[PDB]
Design a protein around this nucleic acid. Structure first.
Ligand code: K
Ligand code: MG
Ligand code: MG
Ligand code: MG
Ligand code: MG
Ligand code: MG
Ligand code: MG
Ligand code: MG
Ligand code: MG
Ligand code: MG
Ligand code: MG
Ligand code: ZN
Lengths: 122, 207, 37, 175
RNA sequence: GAUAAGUGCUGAAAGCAUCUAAGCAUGAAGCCCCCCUCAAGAUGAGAUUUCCCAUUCCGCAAGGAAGUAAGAUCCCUGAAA
RNA sequence: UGGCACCUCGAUGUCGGCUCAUCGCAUCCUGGGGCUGUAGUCAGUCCCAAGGGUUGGGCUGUUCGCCCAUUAAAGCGGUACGCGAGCUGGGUUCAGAACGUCGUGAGACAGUUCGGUCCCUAUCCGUCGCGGGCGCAGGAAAUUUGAGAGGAGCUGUCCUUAG
RNA sequence: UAUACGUUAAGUGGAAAAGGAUGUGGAGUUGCUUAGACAACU
């Protein structure tokens, strides 16, 4: 459950280390984002010499959450952290490598580049 | 229009053929009996009166026994009517069984919601609290009763009072399974009322 | 449609009519449709 | 009224009857038409010569006079010759077909459009880009013809859509 | 289903024309329904099914009183309330 | 914004915010239309329409406004500039103190600044719930019709039609 | 639910202007008109 002021780890090499959630997209009063949802965020921590720089307003997709996601078959998946990937509008990641496992839910939302790049898609 | 009376037994879950896990409510409906057919000529409208759940003789009184004498059945604990039914397809004394429904059929389920007793505006009407800190002395109160001009409160200003225990219909539930041997209906999702409470399952009115 | 208090012929071909106790101007030119109001 | 004063010579094979309620029936080759008229209208039939008479010269009566004559004139010509309104389909791909007793129109929508003619009307479709409404009552032909044209009224840039036969569609310049 | 703005058909007054005067349509998240809930104190107190049955006193009657029928309550064990 | 001084000085508590709304339509979105200097996508303007909906933050006591990010939309007003015997008390106008300035001065603002007690057990009507009594031409047990009342009423994106 | 004679169709009566209008009633003037008008038809 990602909301405004939630800080996320970045699971790629775009240059951002930590982002702060500015806004959850996709409906007027929408309070919370979950895995697979796109958020607007600011880069709070950046890697020196990265493509993305501290203080930039970027779009990201949430790839891991502590709350996790329930599946139709009645199973659940949770992670120990909330992580996102900086993206463009076409849903390609702005980085080139994805770190850590990502949820199967990204395939449903057509984040296929991210899924292919992930070291594990659970 | 089809319908049947039953008791709410509880909830569980069932795996679908495609692997999905569907939560279901178990409704137990010992065969209902048609006690009376009302007609437009005699009564002014068409309806079938279903009796359910045979009551002990001791608990039944003489007026009840006479009413169910024509149907030739034990007195029933629960009597309800169904309107919109095919009158000619029913006869007094006919037993209505769960097998009128089939898996996948869409039904409406009526019941009385669980009572909650005296509840405040927050719980009863889902209103917002005031601040809990910053000097606030306004936490679970129901809000201004209205403007000054009318010199009175408008009707429908929501306030604390008894909550729950109202008749409530849930529409467009799916029948998951019909266990004719045990007279059970498995309906997807949940329905109003406490366990053992009377439930009415009708063919969906929006179908 | 022009909805104005002053409905008048704008050209010679405009015709003033009264439909439903309302003064109107119908004309071949669609810009000249007027209704009083 | 000039219009109301006119007298309608009934053709040979047309029969006009009335029930003294100003309910003139008119049988003829194409069919039968019934129409209740305003009580205070003297309708006379003297050997295939119809005339209407106004009792008093006054706004309401003057109007009803001319109308009653006009409507009678249509009833007689209707059952004898009958009326018809022609429609034209303009536009690439616009075409009309008759699936039994239902006009089917492919007028650039994502579905076909079906008009079912009401009792008394026939819709001939000589070509695919020409429709013909036929009937005894002049009102019903106009009504049905209007319904069909309403499906795709002529637009002003290219003229596409169902228009009436010989309708002066007011064209505009696009770019 | 009936309408609003709008679109009309037939049609005179006013040989033409005109959605209108008579007449006939179409047409909105809106109106009346459809859907959910309460509802006969609706004093206009409704309707249907079933049950009980014409007792004993007095008073000239009107009427009053006393036991009861069907049924219900007090009281008691409780909660799904 | 004013003009008047008719009610209130043996008291009709203030700006902003919070809780709760309600109404008008001069309609912000959604719905239906006329005209266009409307090709399409968009728009402009006018008509009908009040059913529902009409965001979260940074700065500031703020209303407002600017800005950040969204949304179909971020409507305009009335209700004692709705709502303090419902809350808050940051601003402003009690007593302290200080700066600038004015004054011979006590002090003052043509300006600022830090700190500063928000009382009341609901009688009546009203509002939300729950009972007792009687009535409804016999006494009861169930099931009901619906005069009438309330509720709900929102909308995005994508695929297809079809490049 | 008077009498007599007219007016209004707007529930005007029972709320407001400039302005607009083939609403309707009553007076008057004047152009043309069976050597044939207005309208519609070559
Ligand atoms: K000094
Ligand atoms: Mg406290
Ligand atoms: Mg009052
Ligand atoms: Mg004075
Ligand atoms: Mg006083
Ligand atoms: Mg006081
Ligand atoms: Mg308006
Ligand atoms: Mg105020
Ligand atoms: Mg108050
Ligand atoms: Mg303060
Ligand atoms: Mg009082
Ligand atoms: Zn014109």
């Amino acid at each position: 459950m990602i909301q405004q002021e939630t800080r996320l780890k970045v699971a790629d090499n775009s240059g951002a280390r930590e982002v702060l959630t500015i806004k959850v997209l996709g409906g007027s009063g929408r309070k919370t984002a979950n895995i697979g949802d796109v958020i607007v965020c600011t880069v709070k921590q950046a890697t020196p010499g990265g493509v993305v720089k501290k203080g930039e307003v970027v779009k990201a997709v949430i790839v891991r959450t502590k709350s996790g996601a329930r599946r139709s078959d009645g199973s659940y998946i949770s992670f120990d952290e909330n992580a996102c990937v900086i993206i463009r509008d076409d849903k390609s990641p702005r980085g080139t490598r994805i770190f850590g496992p990502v949820a199967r839910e990204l395939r449903e939302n057509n984040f296929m580049k991210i899924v292919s790049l992930a070291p594990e898609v659970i | 229009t089809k319908g049947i009376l039953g008791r709410k037994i509880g909830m569980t879950q069932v795996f679908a053929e495609n692997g999905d896990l569907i939560p279901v409510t178990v409704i137990e409906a010992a065969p209902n009996v048609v006690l009376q057919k009302k007609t437009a000529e005699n009564d002014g409208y068409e309806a079938i009166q279903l009796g359910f759940d045979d009551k002990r003789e001791k608990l039944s009184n003489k007026p009840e026994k006479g009413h169910v004498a024509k149907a030739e059945t034990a007195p029933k604990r629960f009597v309800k009517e169904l309107r919109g039914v095919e009158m000619d397809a029913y006869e007094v004394g006919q037993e209505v069984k769960v097998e009128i429904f089939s898996a996948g059929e869409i039904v409406d389920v009526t019941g009385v919601s669980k009572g909650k007793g005296f509840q405040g505006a927050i719980k009863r009407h889902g209103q917002s609290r005031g601040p809990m800190s910053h000097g606030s002395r306004y936490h679970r109160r129901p809000g201004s009763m209205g403007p000054v001009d009318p010199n009175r409160v408008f009707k429908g200003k929501l306030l604390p009072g008894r909550m729950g225990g109202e008749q409530i219909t849930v529409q467009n539930l799916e029948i998951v399974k019909v266990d004719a041997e045990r007279n059970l209906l498995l309906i997807k999702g949940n329905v109003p009322g406490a366990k053992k409470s009377l439930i009415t399952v009708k063919s969906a009115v929006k179908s | 449609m022009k909805v104005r208090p002053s409905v008048k012929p704008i050209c010679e071909k405009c015709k003033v009519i009264r439909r439903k106790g309302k003064v109107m101007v119908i004309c071949e030119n669609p810009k000249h449709k007027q209704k009083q109001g | 009224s000039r219009v109301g004063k006119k007298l309608l010579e009934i053709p040979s094979d047309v029969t006009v009857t009335l029930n003294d309620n100003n309910t003139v029936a008119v049988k003829g080759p194409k069919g039968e038409l019934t129409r209740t008229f305003h009580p205070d209208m003297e309708i006379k039939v003297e050997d295939n010569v119809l005339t209407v008479a106004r009792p008093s010269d006054q706004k309401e009566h003057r109007a009803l006079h001319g109308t009653t004559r006009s409507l009678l004139g249509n009833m007689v010509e209707g059952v004898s010759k009958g009326f018809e309104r022609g429609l034209e389909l303009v536009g690439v791909g616009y075409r009309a077909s008759k699936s039994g007793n239902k006009l089917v129109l492919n007028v650039g929508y994502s579905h076909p459009v079906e008009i079912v003619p009401e009792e008394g009307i026939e819709i001939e479709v000589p070509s695919q880009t020409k429709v013909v409404v036929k009937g005894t009552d002049k009102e019903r032909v106009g009504a049905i013809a209007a319904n069909i044209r309403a499906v795709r009224s002529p637009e002003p840039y290219k003229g596409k859509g169902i228009r009436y036969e010989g309708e002066v569609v007011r064209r505009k310049e696009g770019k």
